[PDB]
């Protein structure tokens, strides 16, 4: 996409903010994607972990 | 008709399998997508899921 937005409700407000900022989907290996499929070859990638601390 | 719906429901039942919904990393759901079909010029598509409707 092109613009990142975030919003959360409290009941009177939608509390949304927006930043125009480029976002990209980088494919690993040699074949472009739209999203990685269910099956195929494995490759070493890098990404943000999901641990609390 | 209702009779055809009965012949559909006479012995069929839902079932659970895996789908690669990566928001949750290869989850097993009752709603398992199988062989979506689209070839109509008008842009319609029909999908054959894994649950009885």
């Amino acid at each position: 996409g092109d613009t990142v937005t975030v919003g959360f409700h409290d009941g009177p407000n939608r509390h949304t903010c927006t930043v125009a900022h480029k976002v990209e989907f980088r494919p690993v290996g040699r074949e472009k994607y739209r999203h990685p499929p269910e099956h195929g070859v494995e490759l070493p990638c890098n990404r943000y972990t999901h641990k609390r601390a | 008709d209702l009779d055809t719906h009965f012949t559909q429901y006479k012995l069929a039942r839902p079932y659970i399998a895996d789908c690669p919904n990566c928001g949750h990393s290869r989850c097993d759901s009752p709603i398992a997508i199988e062989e979506v079909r689209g070839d109509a010029h008008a842009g319609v598509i029909r999908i054959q899921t894994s649950a009885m409707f």
Side-chain angles (χ1 to χ4, degrees), chain B residues 7-22:
Chain B
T7 313
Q8 176 70 29
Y9 269 96
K10 60 186 185 301
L11 305 176
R13 65 140 185 174
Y15 66 117
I16 311 175
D18 78 313
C19 86
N21 53 322
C22 293

Side-chain angles (χ1 to χ4, degrees), chain A residues 25-37 40-41 43:
Chain A
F25 172 54
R26 293 173 173 79
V28 288
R30 297 177 163 186
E31 308 177 14
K32 274 78 176 194
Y33 302 150
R34 274 68 195 87
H35 175 283
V41 194
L43 281 182

Side-chain angles (χ1 to χ4, degrees), chain A residues 6-27:
Chain A
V6 38
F8 92 98
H9 293 7
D10 55 356
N13 186 346
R14 317 282 68 81
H15 274 291
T16 64
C17 276
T18 296
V19 170
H21 162 92
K22 192 77 167 67
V23 56
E24 190 57 58
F25 172 54
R26 293 173 173 79

